[PDB]
Ligand binder design. Structure first.
Ligand SMILES: NC1=N/C(=N\Nc2ccccc2)c2ccccc21
Length: 330
């Protein structure tokens, strides 16, 4: 089998992407944030504290004839931005883009933190990291991809995120029309539960490529590109007036600037992030100071190839017995 679904930016800055997912019988369609940096499929629901729901579409398990409460199971997660959510668990039928999994753990939120409530466009998360990170207790549950994998034509999924435009998540096949050149594959470590790999270096604009190993994670659920302070300083030094602002929480730059591109290495291959991808707009409405899309990883503790980087590529998440990651230009 295969599946194919369109993924859409939630706003004009590509702060995150949502993909429609069918849950239950009859189907209840919720727009989920597909997240290769976590491993829980959780949803706003009829169980979510009413004051914590503000415009999201909810899953109502009592209206699904295929829903079953997973007895005794609870979940609780927190994310890199300090947000969190928790609740109980059902199993139900879940379909993405025509690919169906029966008996998928659907984690129903009883509580969500303010950042989730405040974002009416995201109805929950669909985790696509390794199932060793799943938070369900006392019996850890499998991701949608792990449950689907054996049925798929090939044990892979691909992320093709758009810049200010729709894109695609495919399951079970590689669309050879969706990228240019070849796909370069690189090794993955699953020891931290992430799609963790080592970039071979970087360049800033038309500058020379610096060969240096950068270990980090391919995380579709992180918006920005988080890299070592040395690399980030070298990038922003090429932007007149850019500075690291402790009050704002990172590098900012004049909104009037034209940003240089940023290149990262995948083996001997190179992925070029155009400068415009690195502009996250005014820090506050009407300001002429703009937030940068490349930020230091010193605070978060891991380098993160988030959407800023991934949307410049066609990315293969290869779930073969030994997982690997593939990157192509597009
Ligand atoms: N996969 C995720 N990464 C998130 N934040 N990452 C981050 C990195 C550095 C600084 C701040 C946040 C996040 C937030 C909500 C749901 C999923 C995720």
């Amino acid at each position: 089998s295969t599946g194919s679904a369109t993924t859409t930016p939630i706003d004009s800055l590509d702060d995150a992407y949502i993909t429609p997912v069918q849950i239950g019988t009859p189907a209840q369609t919720l727009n989920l944030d597909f997240d290769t940096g976590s491993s829980d499929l959780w949803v706003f629901s009829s169980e979510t504290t009413a004051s914590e729901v503000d415009g999201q579409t909810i899953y109502t398990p009592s209206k699904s004839t295929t829903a079953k409460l997973l007895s005794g199971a609870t979940w609780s997660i927190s994310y890199g931005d300090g947000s969190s959510s928790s609740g109980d668990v059902y199993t139900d039928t879940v379909s993405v883009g025509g690919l169906t999994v029966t008996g998928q753990a659907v984690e129903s939120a009883k509580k969500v933190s303010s950042s989730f409530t405040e974002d009416s466009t995201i109805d929950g998360l669909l985790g696509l990291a390794f199932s060793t990170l799943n938070t369900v207790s006392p019996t850890q549950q499998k991701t949608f991809f792990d449950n689907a994998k054996a049925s798929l034509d090939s044990p892979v999924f691909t992320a093709d995120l758009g810049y200010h435009a729709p894109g695609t998540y495919n399951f079970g096949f590689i669309d050879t029309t969706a990228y240019t050149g070849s796909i370069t594959y690189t090794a993955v470590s699953t020891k931290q539960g992430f799609w963790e790999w080592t970039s071979t270096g970087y360049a800033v604009g038309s500058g020379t490529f610096k060969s240096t190993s950068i270990d980090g994670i391919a995380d579709t659920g992180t918006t920005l590109l988080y890299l070592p302070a040395t690399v980030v300083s070298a990038y922003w030094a090429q932007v007149s007036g850019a500075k690291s602002s402790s009050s704002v929480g990172g590098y900012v730059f004049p909104c009037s600037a034209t940003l240089p591109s940023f290149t990262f290495g995948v083996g001997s291959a190179r992925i070029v992030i155009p400068g415009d991808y690195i502009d996250f707009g005014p820090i506050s409405t009407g300001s002429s100071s703009c937030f940068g899309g490349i930020q230091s990883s010193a605070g978060i503790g891991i380098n993160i190839f988030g959407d800023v980087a991934l949307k410049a590529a066609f990315v293969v998440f290869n779930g073969a017995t030994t997982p690997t990651l593939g990157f192509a230009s597009k």
